[PDB]
Amino acid sequence: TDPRAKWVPQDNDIQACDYWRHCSIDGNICDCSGGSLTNCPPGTKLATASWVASCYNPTDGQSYLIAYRDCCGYNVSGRCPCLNTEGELPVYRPEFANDIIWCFGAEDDAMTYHCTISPIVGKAS
Amino acid sequence: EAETQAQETQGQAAARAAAADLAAGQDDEPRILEAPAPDARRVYVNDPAHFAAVTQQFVIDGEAGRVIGMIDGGFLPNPVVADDGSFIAHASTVFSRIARGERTDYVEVFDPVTLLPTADIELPDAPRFLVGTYPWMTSLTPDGKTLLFYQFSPAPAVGVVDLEGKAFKRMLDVPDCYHIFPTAPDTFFMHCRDGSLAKVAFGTEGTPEITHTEVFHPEDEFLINHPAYSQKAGRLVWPTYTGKIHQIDLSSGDAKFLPAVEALTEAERADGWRPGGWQQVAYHRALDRIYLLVDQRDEWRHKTASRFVVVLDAKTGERLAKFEMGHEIDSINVSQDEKPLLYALSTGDKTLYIHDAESGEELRSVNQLGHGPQVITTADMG
Amino acid sequence: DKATIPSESPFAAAEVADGAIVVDIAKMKYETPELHVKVGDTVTWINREAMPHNVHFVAGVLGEAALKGPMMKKEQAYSLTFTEAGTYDYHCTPHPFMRGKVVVE
Amino acid sequence: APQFFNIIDGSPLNFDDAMEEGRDTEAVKHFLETGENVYNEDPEILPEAEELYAGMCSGCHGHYAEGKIGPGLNDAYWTYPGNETDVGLFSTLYGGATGQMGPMWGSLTLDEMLRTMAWVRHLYTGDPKDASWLTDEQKAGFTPFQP
Ligand code: HEC
Numbered sequence: 139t140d141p142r143a144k145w146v147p148q149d150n151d152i153q154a155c156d157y158w159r160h161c162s163i164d165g166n167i168c169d170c171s172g173g174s175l176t177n178c179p180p181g182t183k184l185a186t187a188s189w190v191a192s193c194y195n196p197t198d199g200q201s202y203l204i205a206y207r208d209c210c211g212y213n214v215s216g217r218c219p220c221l222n223t224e225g226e227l228p229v230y231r232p233e234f235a236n237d238i239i240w241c242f243g244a245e246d247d248a249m250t251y252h253c254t255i256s257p258i259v260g261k262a263s
Numbered sequence: 264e265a266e267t268q269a270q271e272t273q274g275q276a277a278a279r280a281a282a283a284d285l286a287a288g289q290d291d292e293p294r295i296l297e298a299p300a301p302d303a304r305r306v307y308v309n310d311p312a313h314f315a316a317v318t319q320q321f322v323i324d325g326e327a328g329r330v331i332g333m334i335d336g337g338f339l340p341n342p343v344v345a346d347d348g349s350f351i352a353h354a355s356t357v358f359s360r361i362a363r364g365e366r367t368d369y370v371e372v373f374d375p376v377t378l379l380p381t382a383d384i385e386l387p388d389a390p391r392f393l394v395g396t397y398p399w400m401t402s403l404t405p406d407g408k409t410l411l412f413y414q415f416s417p418a419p420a421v422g423v424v425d426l427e428g429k430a431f432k433r434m435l436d437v438p439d440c441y442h443i444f445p446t447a448p449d450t451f452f453m454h455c456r457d458g459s460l461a462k463v464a465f466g467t468e469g470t471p472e473i474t475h476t477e478v479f480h481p482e483d484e485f486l487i488n489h490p491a492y493s494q495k496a497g498r499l500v501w502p503t504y505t506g507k508i509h510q511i512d513l514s515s516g517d518a519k520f521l522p523a524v525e526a527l528t529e530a531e532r533a534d535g536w537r538p539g540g541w542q543q544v545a546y547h548r549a550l551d552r553i554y555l556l557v558d559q560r561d562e563w564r565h566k567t568a569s570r571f572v573v574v575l576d577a578k579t580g581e582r583l584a585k586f587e588m589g590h591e592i593d594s595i596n597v598s599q600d601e602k603p604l605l606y607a608l609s610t611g612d613k614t615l616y617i618h619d620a621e622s623g624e625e626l627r628s629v630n631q632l633g634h635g636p637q638v639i640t641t642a643d644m645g
Numbered sequence: 646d647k648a649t650i651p652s653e654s655p656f657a658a659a660e661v662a663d664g665a666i667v668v669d670i671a672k673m674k675y676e677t678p679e680l681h682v683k684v685g686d687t688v689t690w691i692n693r694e695a696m697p698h699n700v701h702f703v704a705g706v707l708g709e710a711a712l713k714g715p716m717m718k719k720e721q722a723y724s725l726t727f728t729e730a731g732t733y734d735y736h737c738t739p740h741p742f743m744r745g746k747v748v749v750e
Numbered sequence: 751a752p753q754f755f756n757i758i759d760g761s762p763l764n765f766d767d768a769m770e771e772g773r774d775t776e777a778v779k780h781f782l783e784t785g786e787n788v789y790n791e792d793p794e795i796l797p798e799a800e801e802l803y804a805g806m807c808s809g810c811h812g813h814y815a816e817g818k819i820g821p822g823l824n825d826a827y828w829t830y831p832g833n834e835t836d837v838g839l840f841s842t843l844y845g846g847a848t849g850q851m852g853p854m855w856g857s858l859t860l861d862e863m864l865r866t867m868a869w870v871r872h873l874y875t876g877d878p879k880d881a882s883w884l885t886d887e888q889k890a891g892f893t894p895f896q897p
């Protein structure tokens with residue numbers, strides 16, 4: 139598969155990098171290290187702040203706003219790595235930038251990157 | 264594991280010498296080597312290792328295609344190299360229990376030959392901005408006596424570290440701007456959210472002088488995170504997602520905006536060509552040329568590797584050449600000497616390909632460079 | 646010390662008392678940038694857009710420590726009761742460019 | 751004909767309280783009949799509209815309606831949803847909202863309210879396509895406000 143080709147979302151496997159909610163994920167899918175699609179793995183710290191992205195859901199044809207909160211305080215999982223950038227903007231537009239470690243707000247001031255969750259926070263455009 | 268033609272030649276030459284030395288009755292007497300003196304062909308490759316807690320930097324002789332040394336780093340360190348080759352340093356982050364516990368942000372300075380640390384400066388209150396490695400989020404002033412680093416939260420600010428006195432000085436409050444481009448011992452520019460550039464003049468005490476330039480690009484034009492900046496020429500080369508290039512001349516001390524040029528031809532843009540990668544642009548000072556990583560790709564695949572590099576005259580915007588790299592390249596940079604080498608780093612192959620910057624021909628390669636190498640740094644010793 | 650937290654976690658905006666001092670958050674901004682209130686008043690922030698936001702006061706503003714309010718989703722609220730007179734600046738954690746101010750008189 | 755109701759309690763607005771002066775203009779008559787404010791983006795009334803806003807509204811809503819001690823009025827968000835239409839905006843000024851934002855019929859003539867409204871619309875910083883209070887021709891010449 140050509141990495142430069144237009145990204146095509148699917149809604150049948152959350153551990154694959156083309157799962158629709160991962161349209162702007164950067165790092166690793168938490169479900170592959172003990173977490174779930176929207177929950178952090180045991181022992182890690184859940185961030186409160188994050189970058190977001192409007193991802194298209196091929197199932198219902200609607201676009202949802204996904205909040206890419208990172209699970210922190212652990213070394214990177216190394217499992218299910220992915221990097222998608224649908225609508226991702228440069229660092230001077232942080233609200234949509236994904237190279238930033240979005241660990242702010244995590245308990246114990248944890249700032250190391252372990253994995254990222256893909257929860258829906260609302261409908262987008 | 265797998266040997267490149269270059270390391271294969273080195274390995275053979277070394278075996279030849281060991282065998283000959285043995286036969287001639289020479290004895291082995293182990294010692295610690297010193298790296299060869301820094302030169303125009305030395306190149307540094309940093310491995311952020313896909314956000315791992317610990318990282319590595321490789322010191323490479325670009326001429327021979329040989330690793331001459333290494334440096335250990337913490338979480339997402341920011342590397343800097345003195346243009347005069349007198350030292351190398353990095354802003355780094357470590358924790359008491361691998362990835363958790365007490366966090367310590369610090370700056371380490373290294374001897375360019377022995378690679379031993381000559382300074383270890385702790386940064387109060389863990390002020391480092393943890394983000395994918397952007398070369399210009401941590402910079403050296405032209406005199407090499409000061410290091411400046413960026414803080415994102417809780418408020419935009421730039422830390423001042425006195426490398427001469429080996430001590431942290433103070434945090435400078437700045438507007439909502441990003442990146443740091445030093446032009447003098449006490450002055451540096453930043454790029455702001457409103458599209459303007461901010462000139463910041465500071466001192467040992469007092470609030471800094473901040474002045475904004477005119478807005479040089481609209482809200483819908485996106486400037487990449489990896490612009491090329493030549494401190495010796497005071498040239499800031501900033502590409503956009505489409506390949507349009509904004510050049511700023513800071514050599515006078517104030518920002519002078521040069522005419523924007525399209526790095527891609529009319530036909531290429533119509534055929535879907537766009538720049539893409541990590542360090543997508545490179546600038547050669549002496550030749551006044553720009554190198555840009557490009558390929559055919561969808562508009563939102565701007566961080567994927569590219570297989571081509573286009574070269575253009577920075578003064579006129581004239582297309583000089585287009586190279587087929589033959590590999591998935593993520594970052595590029597060039598040596599700053601007379602006959603430059605074109606460095607092409609592949610994160611996926613964890614390999615540094617070394618090409619002739621003029622013909623685009625691949626000369627040699629160095630593999631096994633960590634887990635996810637992404638940043639190339641060279642010194643402008645001219 | 647200078648403010649109390651009526652609720653640690655954000656609540657439905659529907660629970661917001663009628664006629665309460667409210668600061669709406671929408672279009673990447675606190676709609677009322679310089680709110681003036683009297684000592685004892687309870688200020689309530691309500692996020693009106695999908696984009697999550699919060700209020701964040703750096704250390705030394707409301708107390709010795711900083712106050713990193715929880716992130717509010719669309720139609721969620723968070724309150725703070727100011728006990729001391731003075732001016733209090735705040736911003737949104739992930740969006741440092743978003744700034745607001747509360748003036749207690 | 752538009753329905754003019756108090757935006758808070760939904761009661762019918764009483765135009766009998768309106769000042770006698772300024773209820774005769776072509777603008778007012780057209781507005782009461784269609785709910786359309788012909789002063790929007792009208793170069794000939796903008797200068798005065800700006801003066802009206804400056805003396806009567808800027809103190810609370812900001813020099814450019816970006817908001818100050820009172821809420822901003824220059825973007826697509828409205829506490830009272832009906833304010834995205836001129837009938838709603840008018841109703842807010844005439845009948846008042848809550849707190850210090852009270853009825854303006856005692857200080858502004860019907861015509862002055864429409865002119866003041868035109869300036870508020872002129873300060874919009876949103877996308878022209880989203881200015882439903884503007885005609886197609888007006889949208890074509892509209893540019894989001896900038897200080
Ligand atoms: C301070 C004493 C004010 C002056 C003078 C003006 N306004 Fe105002 N306005 C004020 C407040 C405190 C509020 C919030 C009221 C509430 O019930 O929440 C408002 C509100 C408005 C609105 C509604 C905005 C919305 O989001 O729906 C509008 C359209 C408005 N104000 C307009 C307006 C104009 C045109 C004024 C000059 C004649 C004006 N206001 C003055 C406080 C104050």
Ligand code: NA
Binds near residue numbers: 824825827828
């Ligand atoms: Na508004």
